[PDB]
Input
Amino acid sequence: PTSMKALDHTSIASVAPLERGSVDTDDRNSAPRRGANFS
Amino acid sequence: MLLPVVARAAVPAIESAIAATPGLVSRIAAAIGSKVSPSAILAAVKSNPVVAGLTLAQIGSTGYDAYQQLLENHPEVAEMLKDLSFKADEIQPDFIGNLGQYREELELVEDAARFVGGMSNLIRLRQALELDIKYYGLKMQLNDMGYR
Amino acid sequence: QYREELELVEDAARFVGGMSNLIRLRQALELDIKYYGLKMQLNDMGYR
Amino acid sequence: MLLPVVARAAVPAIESAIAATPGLVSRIAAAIGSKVSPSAILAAVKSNPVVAGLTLAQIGSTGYDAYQQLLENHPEVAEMLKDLSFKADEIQPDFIGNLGQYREELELVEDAARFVGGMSNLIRLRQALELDIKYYGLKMQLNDMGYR
Amino acid sequence: QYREELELVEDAARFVGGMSNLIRLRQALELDIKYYGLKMQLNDMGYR
Amino acid sequence: MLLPVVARAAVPAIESAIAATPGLVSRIAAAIGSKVSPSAILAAVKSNPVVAGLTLAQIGSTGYDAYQQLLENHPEVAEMLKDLSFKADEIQPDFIGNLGQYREELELVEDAARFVGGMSNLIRLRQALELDIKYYGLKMQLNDMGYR
Amino acid sequence: WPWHEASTEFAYEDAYSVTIRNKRYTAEVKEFELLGLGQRRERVRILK
Output
């Protein structure tokens, strides 16, 4: 099969924000929140 | 009932544990709730995978491979078996007061991390700054030869 | 003789949710208080 | 320059601490980096509120009120002094592996708390179920007499 | 004799941010590894 | 939580290494950060696969099969386990100056390589020129008789 | 720009209970069942 391993190892031209923050937040999921009890 | 792939590894395990020592028989009879006879507890194991996992939790040396194989073949039993087999650990008296001294410092680590990038990027940057200087010279020398 | 017992257990299960939910709730109310203090301190430091 | 409103209460407390002991004068001279003489460190206190705050961190028995007054007057000395005053506390070797044993159980506390409501709702429900039966009987009898 | 030293300090501060940021980053890279492992474990259990 | 497929290969190997020698137990307790007891470090191994990989790296004789099977079944742990597992490969004092003398040679090797083809073509051509002259005479005899 | 400070995670569970002649009936509900979805998607975020 046509290999793409040489084409695979590239790099994207990185360029900095004006404001930092929100870095390590890529893959996180907390539990769903409940509703209040009804009466 | 119980899967035969599980049973072929679980039944001689429990039978060999009983043949090794009989004091575990009354223990699993009290823990599961069956009659103290080995035929009764073995029929309970062959009938119910929850009972089988409870017995394979009560015997731990010769039953770990059979327990993990039951956990492979029966995915539906896992949460119920973990809920039934639960023992709360004891807490140290000084643990929360010892933890409260570190709030001033995990915040420092996170403020370093928000600048550097990932937590992995912080670890690798700290390793690179702790690294020896001859590696910097070797990097400059391989780039001096025309290798990148 | 156990019909007095099982009907009460099934009513508490209908209240709470699953039977496993009832078991975990009974364990959490049976649990020690220092764990509640520990979780309150982890929420105090900003961790959820 | 230090403001006189702070300086009126800040200077004689440091002077009384020096008159109590001179062994802290060498400590604060090596800490700030001024001359060991009391007039030189007192001139540094009068000329720099950061040096004044570092002295009121070295001594805090009597200088706590003056430290709070300089805190309430200047915020920027505190913003810099939190960075300049940092001691990394000692961590136990058993701490993180000890904390791993509680993962199974804080999850159980939160899975109860999401159902009950708040943390205070869980604590009050725990107390109400742990409470005596005669309080339930008193509640029923006050409802029997026609009270709510 | 200190023109060699202050120039390097100010060049590092230009990259990092403020001098407060330089002091805090120097403290963090001077800090022990156990705190990094502790923060990794609290993130592993699901606490931000 | 660690997979049962990994756990079947991981837990008895760690238990066998501890039963073989207990001197590794304090070593892995200081490396991971748990309590020194085998039950506590086994709870840490069963709880966290990063801790499992750290233990299977610390015991090096018997844990290679379990280490590579963990690396197969948990592919996402590899980067962080490589970040935590880092030791300084010690550099030699004469290595950079000994390396700098070979620029004269590697450039000639790469230029001959570009003239021939690949490095494989260069190695095969060097073997063809190293091979005996009797083979050239034999292949001329086969070409005269008709064997291409 | 920081999209994470100006967006929020959206997941929810609620339940309705009613007594019909000395028997309590509970009805759980999730957010994807309300939104017209069949599958629980977990990547999506609402701008606050």
Notes: The beta strands of chain A are 33-34. The CA atoms of residues 15 and 21 of chain A lie 15 Å apart. The longest strand of chain A covers residues 33-34.
